[PDB]
Amino acid sequence: TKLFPKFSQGLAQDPTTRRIWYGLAMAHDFESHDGMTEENLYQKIFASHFGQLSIIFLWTSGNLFHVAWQGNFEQWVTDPVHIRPIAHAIWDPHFGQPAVEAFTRGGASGPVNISTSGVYQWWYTIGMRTNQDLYVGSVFLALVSAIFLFAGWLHLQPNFQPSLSWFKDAESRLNHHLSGLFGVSSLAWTGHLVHVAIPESRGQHVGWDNFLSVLPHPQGLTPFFTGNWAAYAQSPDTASHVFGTAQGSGQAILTFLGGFHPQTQSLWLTDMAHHHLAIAVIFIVAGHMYRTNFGIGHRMQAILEAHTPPSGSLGAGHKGLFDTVNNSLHFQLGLALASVGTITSLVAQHMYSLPPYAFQAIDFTTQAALYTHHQYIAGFIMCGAFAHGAIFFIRDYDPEQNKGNVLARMLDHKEALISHLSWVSLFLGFHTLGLYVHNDVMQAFGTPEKQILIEPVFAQWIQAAHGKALYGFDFLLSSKTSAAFANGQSLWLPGWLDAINNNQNSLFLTIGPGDFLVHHAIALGLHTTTLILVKGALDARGSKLMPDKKDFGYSFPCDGPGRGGTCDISAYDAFYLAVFWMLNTIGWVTFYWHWKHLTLWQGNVAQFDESSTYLMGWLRDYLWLNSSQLINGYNPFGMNSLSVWAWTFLFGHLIYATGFMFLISWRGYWQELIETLVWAHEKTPLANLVYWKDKPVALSIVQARLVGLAHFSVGYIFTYAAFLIASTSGRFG
Amino acid sequence: DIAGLTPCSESKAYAKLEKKELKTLEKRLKQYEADSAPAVALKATMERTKARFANYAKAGLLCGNDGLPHLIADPGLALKYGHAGEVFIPTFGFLYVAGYIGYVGRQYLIAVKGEAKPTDKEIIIDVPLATKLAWQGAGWPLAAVQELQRGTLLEKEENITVSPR
Amino acid sequence: EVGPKRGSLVKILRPESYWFNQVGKVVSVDQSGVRYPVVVRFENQNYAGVTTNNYALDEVVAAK
Amino acid sequence: MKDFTTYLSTAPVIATIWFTFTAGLLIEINRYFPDPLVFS
Amino acid sequence: WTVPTLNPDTPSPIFGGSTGGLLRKAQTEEFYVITWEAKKEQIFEMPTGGAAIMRQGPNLLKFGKKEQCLALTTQLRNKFKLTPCFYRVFPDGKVQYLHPADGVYPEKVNAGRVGANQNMRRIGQNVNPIKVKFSGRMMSPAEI
Amino acid sequence: AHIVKIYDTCIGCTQCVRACPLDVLEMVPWDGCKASQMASAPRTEDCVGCKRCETACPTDFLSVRVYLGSESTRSMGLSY
Amino acid sequence: HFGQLGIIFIWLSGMYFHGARFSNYEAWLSDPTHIKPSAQVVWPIVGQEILNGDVGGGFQGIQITSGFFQLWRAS
Amino acid sequence: PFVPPSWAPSVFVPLTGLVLPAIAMATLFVYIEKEAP
Ligand code: CLA
Ligand code: CLA
Ligand code: CLA
Ligand code: CLA
Ligand code: CLA
Ligand SMILES: CC1=C(/C=C/C(C)=C/C=C/C(C)=C/C=C/C=C(C)/C=C/C=C(C)/C=C/C2=C(C)CCCC2(C)C)C(C)(C)CCC1
Ligand code: SF4
Ligand code: SF4
């Protein structure tokens, strides 16, 4: 039999091409490998994580190397407002001379790509000023990548493999990760800001060659050890400060100004220094909570066992959950993806409205790409969070050990949960779609005053509480007599209120009826996607149509045409259907973010306010209007620098449409077609001399759903990425 | 006014919008005769347009910078400033009709469950019974509440089939 | 002398049955000591179109 | 005639009459009360 | 009843031939032979496509996979009321007999058969997947 | 090879055996049902996974179950 | 098949009837090159009367692309 | 010291785009087809 795959004898004995496809697709499902034990499972995962870490630091090293080698960082730092950053050089032998000239720009030697990832603003903010600064960072991270790779090898060796119990020491790992991984890293990052980043923003060079002889503050550690910590907040950078120079600069290293630096339109460095110092203290303290070898602290099992409501409303409460979580990796992975997935959305939300990197706001293409980038990654991570929660129920859930606790009771009323998610999705869809169609008919008939425009009073009321005085609510921070206004009037409100009431920045943009409709469409996306994913998890173990679904696993094709038909009945298929709704939801979010910002960046916000209340405005004034430059990247008269995005735009449409083939036409048609191809090859003279070793067969039922979904997603992403960058960059960049 | 809005009766953009719509209608009018069929139809449209803009201003709606009416949904703000007719009152108008339709259908469904062949009473409607239940549904909120308090609104958990768990 | 009477109504208690927690009419009860003697008929068919099924003595209880 | 009235009681026939009636009522209301946006 | 012995020289039906017949698999892995007795010459439908005339008396056909042989068996049995039997033939010359395994078609109960893959429980009494985890291979709760 | 299991709710209707298009199943004597016969799966190496047997089983839930497993020339239904 | 034929005649009858009662065919005959054919008129409800466009011949209606005016002239 | 030569793309782009893929595909094709002892 064939060697590959070495981890499954069932696959290795398969004489068809399914062996190749399935061997690739089951490589990282360690639980399903032949001869796998629990202890070996954890040691493989531990080694794999070292490999992922090494790739991350190598990928970062490659970015640093290419910007220094081929970028214009040293030129960009001089005039960041009027210089486009360079990502890397182009060496494409297929280019014609017009293409070579078209992509030559920014004073570069030859053709180059313009960066959109914002690494220039990030690196410039943290104190990088020269190409040698980037070179040393690149070599340092390449070395760090090597060390992690060695550690992955080291801990696979006979005397360094951790035992099973080592991976299940919950109290000790939480203490270290909270205090050391989070707390000390944030404390160290405060050191960089105080010692390097802040001085560099004031025109003073600080490097490894002289940082031991430079005083971060005129009073060196006397305020710190004497408790007079307020001395570090005196004489902050003035409003006239020019970033990177000593004119208008101050001396404070810890402040709470609370606003935006007037020139760079980004958060103050002294606030970001005090921010990281504050959480570092909290995280270091929080890391002394759990039990270890020293006889103090909590044991997490005791905490869970205690929290059972005395009235029996939650049944057994949280009894038995410690083993349920501590013994299942899919439960832990589901909690990790759910938490990280939400934080990825939070990063996108806060970075566009509180830009932390100098000159990030003015780079419109970078801001658009960064928000879209992280929202699509958050969407995928959330779908994975529910997928592994569904896998937990099939593989790791033990009904006997969870008898009567909160987790078991979720399955008890799963119909109630699913029924109410169904109602909310239907309600939002009916009325959200209905109001849009109503407004479209009114616009078509020429009566824009007959449409249903609902003011977002609840959201506009929140903005009033934060100090936005446009709506006249005179509430909390919007009223100058409230205690909330007075107490903070000496710490951060003067800066915060100044920024929130500036209508040229993205801090709490003004909202109207157009924002009301879009937000309710977003809610429909979140609820429907949750409905599909939640049903896939709660019904994973069985249903009326298939009472014993657990005996078949997480992913199987179907149960056949009997009992009416069971296509797409596994929990794997519920995730597969939910990915479509996730793309649809994130698409609505990113269209809304992009269009509302293009109108702001052009100064004509009235277009969004008027055209966003009906769906023809989106199609006409956003998709059709902003495609004009994209599709002219190359035309019968020539081409320009946008021809790559024009080409990628159609490239996306093709991959997307190809995915329809794997999703619409199913296996039986193709297997019978391949059988005539097998006949044709064997009877053809001069070709039947050559022969195959793996019998050709059609893709499997499950494989084609993944392959179709992969093409659908890739075409989805590449189409909008090309349009997002091209429309934003050509308009302003 | 509320949320920075202004009454449509006092809105400059709102007034300008009416002129634009009437101007469009007038432009088409001058290509016909005085009392021809097309001219009469266009004049009727202009009368409705003028009436519509007077009614919305008379109703005391709020117009934004777009000069288009906006509706207030918070019950407190609606009752505070006399906007109850935009969303708040229509909210209880719809629920009465929606409960009427749902309650009537539920009564009919229970009525035929007692018959020998309930399935044949669903494809082929028992019109005499349906009309009887249609009229009695006007008091559904009273009947609906009394069922809830007597405990006959919901089935017992033990009489409902559920999947293995 | 074993099982419920013919024609009586019973409630099904097999969790994997389509008619779990539902009432059916007893058609006959085998007296030969077979595993599942009780035969029950239902007015609503299952996903396969069947309206009858065999149950053990302890899987069926009298209506209420 | 009993069978014919039974045919008129079938679901498709009832729905056609019912929605024809329901639609007509709504159309007629908007004919005499054009452009309703607020209860007033 | 005794296991029949295949006669390779048995005459075959009158068939022109088609492109739906045996492939290179028959020469390397295996093929299947079906034989039966015909009361009179008659036209039947080949599972590979087309129509063939069965000679009166013994008939023999060769097919590429087992399902094709048992598809023809269903036709001959149900419509023409014959009683066919087919074998598995290997390239080395070995011949394996099956259907009927014991001479009686499986639909009819016969003494001497030993139950196989019979679980003395219901589907709802299987253990949970967690209890058959790390058993060396992907194993369903039904297997144990 | 696929896995085929017969459970003790079988009533010996023989419909699964008739439905099977590869002669995988057969009926054997039994004492656990009125028909005094039970389905058997002695030749699962020829099973292709069509699940025609499950379509034909009257009992609820099924008394014959097919769990698709390792693939091969026979189970993949190849004639080449 | 008789039912299908009967339905086509109702459909054909409607096309000829709407040409007689709700069309500008007579005006079109005089000025075929400047007047747009139209044989459907909508009622003035919920503001849909805007669909009655200016087609020529002192007539308001939906412009048709079925070519019935050209067929009638030829016959 | 770090700056690579100006001719580096001319060698590495063909090397990583045409040469290493050819050897990688040949290595993988032989590996998957290889039969167990
Ligand atoms: C102080 C001691 C210490 C430290 C520093 C670490 C560190 C680490 N451990 Mg842990 N570990 C410890 C003790 C420690 N461990 C002990 C005592 C045990 C035994 C009980 C373990 C057992 C253990 C296991 C079993 C595993 C780890 C793993 C890891 C790694 C997790 C992945 C990672 O890099 O996350 C980095 C995370 C952060 C820096 C924080 C993320 C969250 C913040 C809030 C995100 C946002 C921050 C900021 C805004 C981002 C800026 C971005 C920039 C672009 C601007 C990490 C290197 C895993 C690993 O990868 O191993 C190779 C792993 O499998 N550890
Ligand atoms: C850190 C998070 C994490 C980790 C450790 C795992 C780990 C695992 N997951 Mg999970 N998963 C995650 C995130 C994670 N997942 C996310 C984010 C999602 C949502 C998308 C999922 C959704 C998911 C599903 C639905 C399933 C798993 C499964 C698995 C297991 C097998 C994986 C495998 O064999 O892949 C093999 C890898 C492949 C076949 C290829 C993966 C690449 C895909 C197809 C995209 C390729 C795009 C391509 C590069 C684009 C080219 C563009 C072109 C222009 C060049 C394994 C335990 C499977 C399992 O067995 O669960 C029990 C399973 O069913 N995961
Ligand atoms: C534009 C495409 C589209 C639309 C409109 C919908 C709509 C719907 N999907 Mg679907 N879906 C789509 C694409 C779409 N999906 C795709 C591509 C996939 C991937 C396979 C899925 C996968 C999917 C899943 C897995 C689920 C849904 C669900 C839903 C429902 C969500 C709740 C809702 O909006 O209720 C409001 C209803 C609507 C907006 C539907 C349209 C209503 C129209 C406008 C009514 C018109 C009536 C009018 C009288 C005219 C009739 C004329 C006729 C008689 C001739 C809804 C029925 C969920 C569901 O069923 O929840 C209950 C669900 O679980 N969808
Ligand atoms: C859907 C949720 C929701 C939300 C976000 C709001 C929001 C608001 N409501 Mg409304 N309200 C709602 C539902 C809601 N309401 C419902 C269901 C009812 C009952 C039908 C009311 C009845 C109501 C009244 C009677 C009043 C408001 C008022 C307000 C405003 C300030 C007080 C408040 O409610 O704070 C946040 C909301 C909540 C925490 C939810 C419960 C709110 C209760 C029901 C009303 C609280 C009124 C408050 C004590 C008034 C004090 C005086 C005020 C000037 C500070 C604010 C714009 C007040 C107003 O007009 O301010 C200008 C006011 O007088 N609401
Ligand atoms: C990074 C990958 C890559 C690279 C470096 C190239 C490079 C090239 N491609 Mg492209 N190509 C690629 C990927 C790539 N392609 C892919 C993925 C596709 C499919 C979508 C194509 C499809 C494609 C087509 C259809 C064509 C090209 C052509 C070309 C040539 C254009 C410039 C020219 O005028 O050459 C002129 C070329 C020469 C003067 C000769 C160069 C050297 C030859 C090709 C090999 C010499 C070998 C040597 C004698 C012995 C072995 C040495 C070795 C062991 C070191 C050039 C050789 C064009 C061409 O001319 O191809 C031959 C052409 O028609 N490519
Ligand atoms: C199925 C399943 C699963 C999964 C799950 C998931 C995936 C979930 C998710 C979830 C989520 C994703 C959630 C979230 C949540 C959130 C929240 C709950 C939030 C909250 C917040 C707050 C409370 C806030 C507050 C505030 C404000 C608002 C303002 C100011 C400040 C403060 C803080 C005060 C698992 C694994 C378990 C396993 C089993 C099964
Ligand atoms: S498994 Fe089903 S079809 Fe087969 S004999 Fe038993 S009851 Fe009959
Ligand atoms: S799955 Fe198909 S081949 Fe296998 S036993 Fe059932 S009917 Fe026979």
From TrEMBL, chain H:
Where in or outside the cell it occurs: the entry states: Plastid, Chloroplast thylakoid membrane
| Top-rank taxon, per record | Eukaryota
| Biological role | May help in the organization of the PsaL subunit.
By sequence similarity, the record places it as follows:
Belongs to the PsaI family.
Q: Under which name does UniProt file this protein?
A: Photosystem I reaction center subunit VIII
Record lineage: Eukaryota, Viridiplantae, Chlorophyta, core chlorophytes, Chlorophyceae
